[PDB]
Amino acid sequence: RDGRHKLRLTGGKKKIHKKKRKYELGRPPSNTKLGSRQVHVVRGRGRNYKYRAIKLDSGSFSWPTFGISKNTRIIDVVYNASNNELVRTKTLVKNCIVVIDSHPFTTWYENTFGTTKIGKSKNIDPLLLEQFKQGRVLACISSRPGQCGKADGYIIEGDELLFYKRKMDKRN
Amino acid sequence: DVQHERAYQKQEGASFFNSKRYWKKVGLGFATPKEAKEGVYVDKKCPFTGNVSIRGRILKGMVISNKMKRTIIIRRNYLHYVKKYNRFEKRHKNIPCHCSPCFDVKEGDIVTVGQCRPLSKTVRFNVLHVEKHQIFGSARKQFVLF
Amino acid sequence: GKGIKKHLKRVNAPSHWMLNKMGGQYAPKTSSGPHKLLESIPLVILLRNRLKYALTFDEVKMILIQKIVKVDNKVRTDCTFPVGLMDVIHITKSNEYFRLLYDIKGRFVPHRITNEESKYKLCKVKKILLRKGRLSIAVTHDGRSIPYIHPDVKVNDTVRLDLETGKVLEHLKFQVGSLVMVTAGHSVGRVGVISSIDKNMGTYDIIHVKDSRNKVFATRLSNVFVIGDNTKPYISLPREKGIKLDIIEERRNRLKA
RNA sequence: CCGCCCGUCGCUCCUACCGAUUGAAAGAUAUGAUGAAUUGUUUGGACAAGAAAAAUUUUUUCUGGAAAAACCGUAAAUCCUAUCUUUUAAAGGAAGGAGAAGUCGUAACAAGGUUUCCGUAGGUGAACCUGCGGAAGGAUCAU
RNA sequence: UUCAAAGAAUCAUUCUUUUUAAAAUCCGGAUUUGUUACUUUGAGUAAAUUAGAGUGUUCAAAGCAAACAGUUAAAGCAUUGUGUUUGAAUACUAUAGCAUGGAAUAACAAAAUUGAACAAGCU
RNA sequence: AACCUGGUUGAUCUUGCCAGUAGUCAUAUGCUUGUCUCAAAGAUUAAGCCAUGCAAGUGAAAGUAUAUAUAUAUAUAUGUAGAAACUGCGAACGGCUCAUUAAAACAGUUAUAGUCUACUUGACAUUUAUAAGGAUAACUACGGAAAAGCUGUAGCUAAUACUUGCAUUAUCCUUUUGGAUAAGUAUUUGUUAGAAGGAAUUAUAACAAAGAAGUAACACGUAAAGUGUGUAUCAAUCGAGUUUCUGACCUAUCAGCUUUUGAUGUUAGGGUAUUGGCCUAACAUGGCUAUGACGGGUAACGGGGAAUUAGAGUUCGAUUCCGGAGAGGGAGCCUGAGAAAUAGCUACCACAUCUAAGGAAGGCAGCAGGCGCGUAAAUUACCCAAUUCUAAAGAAGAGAGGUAGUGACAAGAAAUA
Ligand SMILES: [Mg+2]
Ligand SMILES: [Mg+2]
Ligand SMILES: [Mg+2]
Ligand SMILES: [Mg+2]
Ligand SMILES: [Mg+2]
Ligand SMILES: [Mg+2]
Ligand SMILES: [Mg+2]
Ligand SMILES: [Mg+2]
Ligand SMILES: [Mg+2]
Ligand SMILES: [Mg+2]
Ligand SMILES: [Mg+2]
Ligand SMILES: [Mg+2]
Ligand SMILES: [Mg+2]
Ligand SMILES: [Mg+2]
Ligand SMILES: [Mg+2]
Ligand SMILES: [Mg+2]
Ligand SMILES: [Mg+2]
Ligand SMILES: [Mg+2]
Ligand SMILES: [Mg+2]
Ligand SMILES: [Mg+2]
Ligand SMILES: [Mg+2]
Ligand SMILES: [Mg+2]
Ligand SMILES: [Mg+2]
Ligand SMILES: [Mg+2]
Ligand SMILES: [Mg+2]
């Protein structure tokens, strides 16, 4: 299923002469969603287990500027450069932009210096700040939850963030 | 316009926030062009800018097409000896190569391509160095022994 | 079903085993181990076809059962254990010590050797890994990992390695004039000095090796085993001393006897 | 030269062709329909181990979990077409080859008794004849 | 499009040494200079077969063995004890790929409604 | 041994075929055959069908024995065997055939900086304990079914089955002693820092987060304190998957193909052990082709090779080795390091066996053997002795393999004076 059964670039039918060799395995997609955590183990090749997350929430999210990370419930999926169907179904994949319950980062900031190891000097964006004010912040996912079994991700920043906002843009 | 896709075209291996844009050397004496080091453009499968290491064969060709996006065709023209007739005969083979927009390549231009991993259904190569060259018929028809 | 192959057919056996076409259908199939089957040799062959201590596989097995044959000083009861290029065999009852070497043909001889020299073995490093706690480990052709190796050891060079204890004695860099043995194509037994190394960019690094008849021959760097500094070898070489004669010369030599 | 021989027309044998017959047959793909089994997920919840109360029984919560079901996804098989390939029948038709001293002529070989032959068109029992333009492989290397 | 020239050996010929321009490199001396085809050396390849070396399988087809000394020891070599010499070569493993010496023969690239080389000056 | 003779004629010289002529690890068949050596042999037709038997098991210190037997030493102590079964490992090798398959496979040549890898080897570890928890087999008793390698119930009991779960090292001060700070292997994410390799987003180091699995609740009694079994990561190895380049027969009375059905590419993903239209979505309109694409044919598995050649070549290569594929036909899974396994399973189709008619099992292209087909091909033999494999690894198994039997396939030597 990872295999041939496909035209030959010249557009000639490869007359098949070989079954399907198990090492051409194409086991089917875990459309991993939001919800309470729930993950199965699929047994890949040499007992190499991999963790089909099927529901998720509490991924590890990073804040790249400051280079730190925190575990947060993720409250909604809002964009998917693959397809809008996935976002409709609220399915987490390796480049989904999603919304983090983003109090943790704020709390961390407060603990460290001010209110909304240390190479601080950068001191936050405007857009990001605004986002924080509502509690909830946009962030890519970066793990492939379907393989790794974790919704690990990172906060979307400056230029990329702007681009994603534009993409989202509402309007009509 | 750099960001043309539905996704943000980033550049893995860049490192934006901390540290003192990303390109690499690719080796075998193929000089990274100015357009890779300068000149923003994101390419996952650029030899220099992206994350594909060229390794295995290197073979010169001659471009037939630019029609695909960031992807080129090169016919290798060569001579298959036939022992019965102790003579040769022109033969050929169209290698598809990935380009990367550091190289502006019109047809008939000589290129050299390194191997690299399977980038798509057929493109296993990428162009490392583009000699200029000029052509008058169709590149299709130019034999250049090489 | 289809997985790995357990058997070896006696014609498909690598020539320098020197098996028969008759005298069997199969060959021994070296166990996985510290050597590459095409350049190893199982213990069975050693016991039965080289020393001729055994007539049969059965006898070899019996011998092994008495824990009396050691290969690199720790015992082995696996009949088809691969012995390979440099390894000292200590048959305990005879108090014989062999070291495997190459002939001037491709063939393994067991060399015969003193107690004193037996205690070490040469080992060429192949890879030099960094591992946890920035500690470097060399990996020898003996499929053996030497940890905490002396920093000046580089990827191709040999290492005089003790057997009683896992630690190393001294190392011999891959220099321009370093006494070398070969271990692959054509020039296999050959022993030379090295004239020159090519150091090709993407390819195999070919090297040229002057003999003591001053006959230069080339070889891949892959399959060359450093054995000395220009003066003296750090091991006892066989009687021929790696001087692969011409065919005519060999014939003449044969005649004069 | 009482030589050679040409074609129709009969007669016998064999070969392949055309052939109505939606001819037939098997196989191959391609479409579509239904669709066994089943990976995965979802629903399930026979029960087997806990937690709650009464003196072994009652009600409620947490675990693992069989059957059964639903949805994608692999997808056998069967049926229906379509197309193609392959053998294969057929009244009749029309060739060919073989044979037999058969019928009718005399076409060709000699200036073969209209030189021959070409291409083309029409003709005619049959060889063939005729027209037009070619050729000499002419019966003229020549005024 | 660098043709040639001169010296020594041998039985008119063969094999060898030396220099005749220009540019870069090295402490007046000394040493790098288009691409590919082609060719030469290699490298790297399973053996069986094939060619082929050795070996009286009684011959031979074979096989990959064997030979040697002795009515039972000498001789060797080992510090009474231990047989000894060995052999199972080599070449073939494309037409492609790898490195490689190359002077010929081929290509191609370099090259004027203008092309690049230096010395000075300015940025 | 670089070879030619007869045939057109009344004769001649050519062209030209026919005929002869030799060989074939090339089949058949006819007649004939006293030795010996060697030895192909149901490929060609039907990858047609199969009665019976056999072809993968495994215990010699070393998981589990109140089935049980037994010998010592003083009713206990050790012991020594041990049917059975649980556990473990193997059964993915081997063997067979050649139907498929014509840039596919295969050969050489790369590549894996794109991966997986049991056994074997070597390195070698991290956030009640004088010893933990049940619950299961064989077994006992009661059963059922015509039958099946069918299993029901109740009661036990082990395990190396299954499940828990107990200091020291590196960074700073003092004179080897006494304090301070840390302390997760893969794996994953984000942030950086960077002894090789031609080339690194490599090794590695740090920071912020998660995080499997593990580090002996095991068994012998060994060696000159050892071993077996198990175990995280790394490397080696036995490999495997993909992959680069180049290389194939006949056909143009196959010339245009491929693209809604992924054709060509880009992006993002999903999936994979990893790369990849491998799959999904979105977007391009590509890609191949007279140097033969795409079809068709092959009485095609590929190659190493075989025959025959002076030299070229031509034909063959089912068939000793390597590779591929397949186990009646497709398809689908489980186990496992490795299978899309077929003497594993599920299903359908096509064959087909037993049945008390309810059901049940079955797959010789393993070895023999039989029918069929055919021009066309051997014994239902003996053995594990050799060669090897597997195992709890001398000690057991092995139709793998070998030895004979049949054998004018071939090949060699050689009577009949
Ligand atoms: Mg199979
Ligand atoms: Mg007249
Ligand atoms: Mg007439
Ligand atoms: Mg006339
Ligand atoms: Mg008229
Ligand atoms: Mg008329
Ligand atoms: Mg003839
Ligand atoms: Mg006799
Ligand atoms: Mg058959
Ligand atoms: Mg057979
Ligand atoms: Mg044992
Ligand atoms: Mg038992
Ligand atoms: Mg097999
Ligand atoms: Mg366990
Ligand atoms: Mg699509
Ligand atoms: Mg076939
Ligand atoms: Mg074959
Ligand atoms: Mg056949
Ligand atoms: Mg069958
Ligand atoms: Mg199957
Ligand atoms: Mg069977
Ligand atoms: Mg079946
Ligand atoms: Mg049979
Ligand atoms: Mg026969
Ligand atoms: Mg045996």
mmCIF file of C-alpha atoms in Angstrom, chain A residues 42-119:
data_model
loop_
_atom_site.group_PDB
_atom_site.id
_atom_site.type_symbol
_atom_site.label_atom_id
_atom_site.label_comp_id
_atom_site.label_asym_id
_atom_site.label_seq_id
_atom_site.Cartn_x
_atom_site.Cartn_y
_atom_site.Cartn_z
ATOM 1 C CA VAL A 42 0.187 0.371 17.089
ATOM 2 C CA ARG A 43 3.031 -2.090 16.724
ATOM 3 C CA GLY A 44 5.313 -0.866 13.954
ATOM 4 C CA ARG A 45 8.090 -2.955 12.449
ATOM 5 C CA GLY A 46 10.752 -4.203 14.954
ATOM 6 C CA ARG A 47 8.421 -3.901 17.951
ATOM 7 C CA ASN A 48 8.803 -0.121 17.414
ATOM 8 C CA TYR A 49 5.608 1.008 19.106
ATOM 9 C CA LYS A 50 4.071 4.308 18.067
ATOM 10 C CA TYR A 51 1.309 6.166 19.825
ATOM 11 C CA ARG A 52 -1.843 6.852 17.851
ATOM 12 C CA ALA A 53 -3.298 9.735 19.772
ATOM 13 C CA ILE A 54 -6.987 9.730 18.895
ATOM 14 C CA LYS A 55 -8.262 12.337 21.365
ATOM 15 C CA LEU A 56 -6.119 15.054 22.909
ATOM 16 C CA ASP A 57 -6.030 18.360 24.765
ATOM 17 C CA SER A 58 -3.082 18.965 27.046
ATOM 18 C CA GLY A 59 -0.174 19.277 24.618
ATOM 19 C CA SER A 60 3.197 20.849 25.455
ATOM 20 C CA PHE A 61 3.381 24.273 23.901
ATOM 21 C CA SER A 62 6.470 26.337 23.510
ATOM 22 C CA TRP A 63 7.072 30.072 23.465
ATOM 23 C CA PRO A 64 9.961 30.462 21.005
ATOM 24 C CA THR A 65 10.974 34.053 21.792
ATOM 25 C CA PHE A 66 11.847 33.061 25.359
ATOM 26 C CA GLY A 67 12.499 29.423 24.453
ATOM 27 C CA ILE A 68 10.325 27.873 27.162
ATOM 28 C CA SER A 69 7.377 25.455 27.240
ATOM 29 C CA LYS A 70 4.206 24.654 29.216
ATOM 30 C CA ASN A 71 1.403 22.079 29.177
ATOM 31 C CA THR A 72 -2.009 23.528 28.377
ATOM 32 C CA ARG A 73 -5.474 22.395 27.371
ATOM 33 C CA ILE A 74 -6.069 23.337 23.704
ATOM 34 C CA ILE A 75 -9.444 24.830 23.288
ATOM 35 C CA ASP A 76 -10.056 25.003 19.513
ATOM 36 C CA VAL A 77 -8.573 24.346 16.060
ATOM 37 C CA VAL A 78 -8.790 27.345 13.700
ATOM 38 C CA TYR A 79 -6.830 26.641 10.492
ATOM 39 C CA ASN A 80 -5.430 23.769 8.476
ATOM 40 C CA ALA A 81 -3.346 24.399 5.359
ATOM 41 C CA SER A 82 -4.136 20.803 4.325
ATOM 42 C CA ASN A 83 -7.952 21.275 4.272
ATOM 43 C CA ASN A 84 -10.861 23.023 5.986
ATOM 44 C CA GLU A 85 -12.655 19.718 6.580
ATOM 45 C CA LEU A 86 -10.062 18.811 9.203
ATOM 46 C CA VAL A 87 -10.594 22.095 11.025
ATOM 47 C CA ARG A 88 -14.368 21.608 10.896
ATOM 48 C CA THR A 89 -13.882 18.178 12.472
ATOM 49 C CA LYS A 90 -11.427 19.699 15.010
ATOM 50 C CA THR A 91 -8.571 17.371 14.087
ATOM 51 C CA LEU A 92 -5.006 17.941 15.279
ATOM 52 C CA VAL A 93 -2.132 17.502 12.867
ATOM 53 C CA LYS A 94 1.460 18.638 12.475
ATOM 54 C CA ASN A 95 0.718 22.103 11.130
ATOM 55 C CA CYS A 96 -2.665 22.911 12.640
ATOM 56 C CA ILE A 97 -2.951 26.382 14.104
ATOM 57 C CA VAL A 98 -4.903 26.035 17.307
ATOM 58 C CA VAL A 99 -5.858 28.079 20.325
ATOM 59 C CA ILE A 100 -4.143 27.430 23.630
ATOM 60 C CA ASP A 101 -5.595 28.211 27.043
ATOM 61 C CA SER A 102 -2.725 30.666 27.473
ATOM 62 C CA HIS A 103 -2.838 31.640 31.164
ATOM 63 C CA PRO A 104 0.208 29.508 31.963
ATOM 64 C CA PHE A 105 2.618 31.576 29.877
ATOM 65 C CA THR A 106 1.249 34.776 31.405
ATOM 66 C CA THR A 107 1.682 33.322 34.891
ATOM 67 C CA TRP A 108 5.264 32.350 34.081
ATOM 68 C CA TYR A 109 5.971 35.863 32.820
ATOM 69 C CA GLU A 110 4.520 37.350 35.998
ATOM 70 C CA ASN A 111 6.670 35.050 38.123
ATOM 71 C CA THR A 112 9.802 35.996 36.200
ATOM 72 C CA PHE A 113 9.552 39.808 35.680
ATOM 73 C CA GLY A 114 6.640 42.294 35.602
ATOM 74 C CA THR A 115 3.073 41.572 34.394
ATOM 75 C CA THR A 116 2.477 40.802 30.643
ATOM 76 C CA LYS A 117 17.737 31.323 31.490
ATOM 77 C CA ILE A 118 16.784 35.000 31.039
ATOM 78 C CA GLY A 119 17.761 36.770 27.823
#
